[PDB]
Amino acid sequence: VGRLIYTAGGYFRQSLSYLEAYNPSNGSWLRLADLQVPRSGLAGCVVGGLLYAVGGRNNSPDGNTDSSALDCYNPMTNQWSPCASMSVPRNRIGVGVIDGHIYAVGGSHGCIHHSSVERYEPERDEWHLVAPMLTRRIGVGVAVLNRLLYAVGGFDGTNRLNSAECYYPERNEWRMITPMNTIRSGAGVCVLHNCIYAAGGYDGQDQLNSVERYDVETETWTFVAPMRHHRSALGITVHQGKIYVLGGYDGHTFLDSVECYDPDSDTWSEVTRMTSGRSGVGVAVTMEPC
Numbered sequence: 001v002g003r004l005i006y007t008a009g010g011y012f013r014q015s016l017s018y019l020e021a022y023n024p025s026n027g028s029w030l031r032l033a034d035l036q037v038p039r040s041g042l043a044g045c046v047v048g049g050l051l052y053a054v055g056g057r058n059n060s061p062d063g064n065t066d067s068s069a070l071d072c073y074n075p076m077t078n079q080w081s082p083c084a085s086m087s088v089p090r091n092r093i094g095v096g097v098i099d100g101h102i103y104a105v106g107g108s109h110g111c112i113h114h115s116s117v118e119r120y121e122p123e124r125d126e127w128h129l130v131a132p133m134l135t136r137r138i139g140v141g142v143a144v145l146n147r148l149l150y151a152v153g154g155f156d157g158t159n160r161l162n163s164a165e166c167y168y169p170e171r172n173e174w175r176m177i178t179p180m181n182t183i184r185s186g187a188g189v190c191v192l193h194n195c196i197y198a199a200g201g202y203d204g205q206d207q208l209n210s211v212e213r214y215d216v217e218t219e220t221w222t223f224v225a226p227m228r229h230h231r232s233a234l235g236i237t238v239h240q241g242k243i244y245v246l247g248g249y250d251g252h253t254f255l256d257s258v259e260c261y262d263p264d265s266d267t268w269s270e271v272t273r274m275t276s277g278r279s280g281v282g283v284a285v286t287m288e289p290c
């Protein structure tokens with residue numbers, strides 16, 4: 001009990017410093033301590049009850065700087081602290097957590113599209129590089145299932161991608177998995193039960209509302225119910241057995257809508273609205289603040 005969905009950063013006209021937290025139990029939203037540096041295209045994750053904001057870019061009227069930052073937020077103090085920075089800036093990054101360690105995957109730095117991957121150790125406040133992916137990927141979706149790390153879709157600098165790959169930590173090795181049915185850049189990617197879900201994204205032409213899921217046992221991607229809204233660069237997380245998607249860009253608007261997927265009924269329902277429309281947010285779940 002007492003866990004909240006946190007949304008950090010994002011983009012609307014410019015990159016944003018907002019930290020806001022939604023309580024699915026009573027519908028409430030809390031505005032919390034701003035990020036020190038506004039960022040979009042960042043990823044959020046949680047280790048040991050601390051919320052981490054990783055990478056992104058600060059888009060401002062007076063410049064656009066890609067971020068190597070790792071900042072950590074303590075709900076007990078409502079304060080952000082700087083952690084050790086990554087080896088390179090990573091805009092439109094994907095992250096995943098295995099066994100208390102944060103993996104930062106891919107992302108862009110200027111015109112460079114990274115294949116490189118690095119691993120953070122909270123107990124040592126240190127980053128170290130691991131094996132790079134087989135494909136350069138920005139706007140990549142990353143999730144962890146059964147202590148394996150998945151990198152799904154993205155953009156390699158020339159083509160948007162339906163391909164996907166799996167990292168095996170004990171061999172420090174990446175291998176291709178079955179590609180998705182759909183090209184998706186900027187999808188929301190998460191894990192629910194034994195499947196990796198890829199929701200929305202941009203296929204090169206239109207923002208998508210389709211959702212597909214990868215069953216690790218069958219190695220197949222299957223479509224599930226589509227979302228109510230087309231969305232790319234959306235926030236995504238899982239909480240009490242349901243997927244929550246937040247925000248994104250639908251082609252026309254920066255969405256404020258939050259939708260919830262129930263796998264048992266295979267339905268999406270609109271559950272709340274963010275305080276303002278935005279895309280490119282980092283999302284993660286941890287205990288209530290204060």
Ligand SMILES: O=C(O)C[C@H](c1ccc2c(c1)OCCO2)c1ccc2ccc(OCC(=O)NC3CCCCCC3)cc2c1
Pocket residue numbers: 010011040041042092138139140154155160185186187202232233249279280281
């Ligand atoms: O396919 C690609 O080249 C990359 C892909 C993308 C680029 C251009 C697009 C697009 C999607 O579909 C909307 C119209 O053209 C992408 C993927 C992930 C992102 C994550 C965060 C993120 O954070 C800043 C952000 O939200 N930017 C927003 C305005 C500019 C468009 C990008 C989105 C809205 C941005 C991401 C962008």
